[PDB]
C-alpha cells in the first residue's frame, strides 16, 4: 500500500531483535529503559525480555494530532521514574515521525543527570529532525502497529486489517451505549 | 508440559476478554496494568475497546511463604471510576488479590480483574479470562526469560536469540 | 475548646518525637509524609535527624461512615527499609491505619507511626507522639482553613488575613 | 550577621502573606502549586492554606553543593504530578540563589503545556539569573531557614541558633551509632 505500512507481529519481533543486536554491537547495554507511553510499551517490554533488562520506567507523553484535540508540540502528562543519576538510559518508542517526541523525552531525561541517554525507535520517517541512535527501518508512510490498528480502523473505515469483522461487531455494540 | 501461545492466540485472548466485558456490559474508565506481564495485554485491550486511560502498578511475587511486594503505584485519583486490573497470567492469584486490595483503597466505584490465562490452583479467579491451562505458559513477552532458565524449551527463533545472548554474556558486565 | 500551638511548640513537638526515636533507638531509613498536614512535621523531623529520604502519600478522610481515600502514592521501593509515617494529628486514627496498611504492602523491614498530636478517641495510637489533647487543634498550617470555616476563632494575624481574603473573594472565580 | 540571615517563623509568615498579597494584586490565583522539594515544602503548604489552594504537586530536585557530592547544575530525581495542561501553575521555592533550580523546574513544567507557569520564592539573591515572578525580599547572604537550621549546624559548629544545646545532645547520640 502506498499510504500505510502494516507490520505483522513477526516483523515486530524482527524489529526488536534488530534493535537488540545493534545495542550489543555498540556495547550499549542500558541500565534503564524509558518506555514512551503508550506506543513504546510493547517495544520496551519485548526488548526488556530479549536483553534481560530488569528496570523499565515510563513517560506519558502525547502528540495530539486528531479532530478532537490538536497541538503544535508533544505534551507530557506525567513522568513515572525515580532517580536516573549515573545510569545508562535508553528511550524506547515505536516510531519517530517528526522526532519531536523523542527530543522532548531526551531533554527531560537529561535533566535527571544520567550517565548517558540514547534513543531507539522501531521505525523512522525520512523527515525526522533527528535519527534515533537505534532503529530497525526507515519508512515513508503511516505505520499501523498491531497495538493501534483498531484506533486506525475507528478513524478510518477503509483500511484493510485482519479480524475486522469481529472488531466491527464489537465496536458496533460499544457505539450503541 | 508447555503452552506457547502465538501472537494470533494472544489477540484472540484479548478479543475474548473484550467481548466478555462488552457482553457483560462493564466498560472500564481506567485500566491498571500489572507490571510488567500485564502491560502488553493492557495495551492491546485499550486499543480494542478505545480505553484512553491506562495506569500501572509495579508489583512482584517471588513465589518460593512469600507475598507480593509493591514497588510503586503509578496513578492519580481513581475515586468514582470503574477499574479493570489487567495481568497476563493468574497462577497463585496472590498478585491480583494484592492489586485489587490496594486499588480498593483509592475508593473506585468498582474494581474488577482480568488475566489472559488462569492456573487451576489459583486462589482467586479473574472476573474475566480467556483460558484455564495446566501447562507452563511461555508468553511472547517472556520467552527469552524462560529460555535463559532452560535452553531446551521448544520456542521459535531460539537460534537467533542464543546467537545474540552469547555475545551479550561476553560484554556484560 | 481550642488549642493553637505556636511554632515554638511545634518545634518542641518535633524535638520530643526526635528524642523518642533516638531514645527508643529507631532511626528511619525513609519518612512517609501524610499529605498535606504531615508535610511540615516530616520536613522538620527530617532536618532534626538528618533524614535524607522523604516520600509522600496523598490521602484524605471526609469524616462524616466514611473511610480514608488514597489519591496517589509517591514512592519507589521501600523493601527492607525502616519507615516512619508522619502526620500532624491522629484524630480518628483511620488515616494512620490506612497508610500503615498500604506501606506494609511494600514489604518494609518495619513501619512505625508518628503524629504531633493525639485525640482521646483515636482507634490507633501513634508509636510516637508529643501530646494527647481534647481540644480542636488549630495548626499554624491550617489556621486560615479554620478561620474560613469560623471567623471568630482566636488566632493571631486574623485581620491581615481577612483583609487579603476579602480581595480574594472578589476575583475568584 | 554579615554572612547569615536567620529568619524567625514570624518573618516566614510575613513572607508567605506578602507572596499571597502579591498574587491577589496580580490576579494570578494558581490552579496548582508545584512545591520544589524539600525547601519549598513549608512555603507551599503555608501559601496553600493562606489562599485556599487545594492542589499541591511536587518536584524532587536538588543542587548538590557539598563535600560529599558536587554538581554543576540542578538534578531532577522525580516529578510527582499528573496532567497540568490548561492549568495556571505556580512554582514555589524557599530561595532563588543562582536561579538555576527555578529555571530547571519552569522548563520541565512548561513541557506539561500549562496555561501559564510562574515562579515564587520567599527570598532572592542579587546574583540570580532571573527574578522570580513573586518574592518577599532580596538578601545578599546565606539564609538559614527554620526547616534547615540543623543541617547548617551539622555542617557548621559556629553558627548561633536557638535550642542548640538540646540539638547537640540529640546529634551527639545520633553520632554514637
Ligand atoms: N501508529 C502510528 N503512530 C505514529 C506514527 N508516527 C508517529 N506516531 C506516534 O507519534 C510519536 C512520534 O511522533 P513525533 O514526535 O516523532 O512526530 C510516537 O510516540 C508514536 O506513538 C505512525 O506513522 N503510525
Ligand atoms: N511466564 C509464566 N509466568 C508464570 C506462570 N505462572 C506463574 N508465573 C509467575 O509466577 C507468579 C504466580 O503468582 P501470581 O501471578 O498468581 O501472583 C507470578 O510472578 C507470575 O508472573 C506461567 O505459567 N508462565
Ligand atoms: N486542624 C485539625 N484537623 C483535624 C483535627 N482533628 C481531626 N482533623 C481532621 O479530621 C480527620 C481525622 O481523622 P484521622 O486524621 O484520624 O484519619 C483528618 O482528616 C484530620 O486532618 C484537629 O484537631 N485539628
Ligand atoms: N538554606 C539555604 N538554602 C539555599 C540557599 N540558597 C539556595 N538554597 C537552595 O538551593 C535552591 C536554589 O538554588 P539556585 O538553583 O537558585 O542556585 C533552593 O531550592 C534552595 O532550597 C540559601 O541561602 N540558604
Ligand atoms: Mg507514542
Ligand atoms: Mg498514536
Ligand atoms: Mg506479573
Ligand atoms: Mg491529613
Ligand atoms: Mg531546594
Ligand atoms: Mg538546601
Amino acid at each position: 500500500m502506498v499510504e500505510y505500512h502494516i507490520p505483522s507481529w513477526d516483523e515486530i519481533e524482527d524489529a526488536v531483535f534488530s534493535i537488540g543486536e545493534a545495542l550489543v554491537k555498540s556495547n550499549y547495554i542500558p541500565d534503564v529503559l524509558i518506555a514512551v507511553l503508550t506506543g513504546g510499551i510493547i517495544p520496551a517490554k519485548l526488548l526488556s525480555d530479549l536483553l534481560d533488562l530488569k528496570v523499565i520506567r515510563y513517560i506519558d507523553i502525547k502528540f495530539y494530532r486528531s479532530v478532537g484535540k490538536t497541538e503544535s508540540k508533544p505534551v507530557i502528562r506525567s513522568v513515572y521514574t525515580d532517580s536516573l543519576e549515573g545510569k545508562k538510559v535508553l528511550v524506547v518508542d515505536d516510531v519517530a515521525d517528526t522526532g519531536e517526541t523523542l527530543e522532548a523525552v531526551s531533554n527531560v531525561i537529561t535533566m535527571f543527570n544520567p550517565a548517558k541517554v540514547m534513543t531507539a525507535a522501531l521505525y523512522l520517517k525520512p523527515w525526522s529532525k533527528r535519527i534515533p541512535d537505534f532503529y530497525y527501518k526507515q519508512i515513508d508512510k503511516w505505520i499501523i502497529f498491531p497495538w493501534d490498528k483498531w484506533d486506525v480502523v475507528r478513524e478510518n473505515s477503509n483500511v484493510p486489517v485482519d479480524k475486522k469483522e469481529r472488531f466491527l461487531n464489537l465496536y458496533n455494540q460499544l457505539l450503541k451505549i
Side-chain angles (χ1 to χ4, degrees), chain A residues 36 39 63 74 93-102 125 141-145 148:
Chain A
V36 182
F63 209 142
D93 209 354
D94 49 4
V95 51
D97 191 279
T98 67
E100 290 291 332
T101 295
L102 284 180
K125 306 292 180 68
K141 36 199 186 185
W142 194 259
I143 306 146
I144 305 175
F145 297 93
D148 61 17

Side-chain angles (χ1 to χ4, degrees), chain A residues 100-119:
Chain A
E100 290 291 332
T101 295
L102 284 180
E103 176 176 287
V105 173
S106 296
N107 285 345
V108 66
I109 293 298
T110 295
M111 305 174 82
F112 285 68
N113 192 34
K116 185 63 170 157
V117 209
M118 300 190 91
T119 60

Side-chain angles (χ1 to χ4, degrees), chain A residues 33-50:
Chain A
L33 297 184
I34 299 300
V36 182
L37 302 173
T38 58
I41 281 166
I42 276 112
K45 174 61 186 170
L46 295 184
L47 184 64
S48 162
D49 180 50
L50 180 64

Side-chain angles (χ1 to χ4, degrees), chain A residues 4-175:
Chain A
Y4 290 120
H5 181 62
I6 315 183
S8 70
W9 281 109
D10 279 300
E11 181 172 327
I12 298 301
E13 293 190 353
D14 183 32
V16 169
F17 265 113
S18 301
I19 301 292
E21 284 156 1
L23 288 163
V24 166
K25 171 183 186 180
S26 278
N27 196 8
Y28 190 74
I29 306 308
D31 295 310
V32 182
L33 297 184
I34 299 300
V36 182
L37 302 173
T38 58
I41 281 166
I42 276 112
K45 174 61 186 170
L46 295 184
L47 184 64
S48 162
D49 180 50
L50 180 64
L51 293 185
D52 201 12
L53 309 176
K54 293 179 172 55
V55 180
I56 310 175
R57 295 300 184 264
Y58 313 88
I59 182 161
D60 179 355
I61 177 181
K62 222 209 174 295
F63 209 142
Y64 302 109
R65 307 260 75 230
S66 270
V67 159
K69 187 162 173 55
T70 285
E71 290 292 339
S72 164
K73 286 304 185 69
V75 171
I76 299 173
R77 307 191 292 183
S78 60
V79 183
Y80 298 136
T81 183
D82 204 296
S83 171
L84 301 170
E85 200 166 16
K87 307 270 177 62
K88 283 176 300 179
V89 175
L90 180 73
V91 177
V92 180
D93 209 354
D94 49 4
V95 51
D97 191 279
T98 67
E100 290 291 332
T101 295
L102 284 180
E103 176 176 287
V105 173
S106 296
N107 285 345
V108 66
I109 293 298
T110 295
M111 305 174 82
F112 285 68
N113 192 34
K116 185 63 170 157
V117 209
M118 300 190 91
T119 60
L122 303 185
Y123 300 97
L124 170 62
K125 306 292 180 68
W127 46 82
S128 183
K129 60 151 49 175
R130 192 195 179 261
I131 304 181
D133 299 291
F134 303 91
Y135 71 97
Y136 163 66
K137 261 166 48 193
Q138 187 174 257
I139 197 137
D140 61 355
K141 36 199 186 185
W142 194 259
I143 306 146
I144 305 175
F145 297 93
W147 49 86
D148 61 17
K149 56 183 295 188
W150 302 125
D151 202 68
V152 170
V153 171
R154 282 191 291 274
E155 276 192 351
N156 196 324
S157 321
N158 178 13
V159 316
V161 304
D162 301 332
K163 308 187 178 179
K164 194 192 305 181
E165 174 174 356
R166 192 177 184 175
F167 171 73
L168 289 170
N169 217 267
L170 192 66
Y171 187 31
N172 196 249
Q173 289 175 309
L174 280 176
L175 286 179

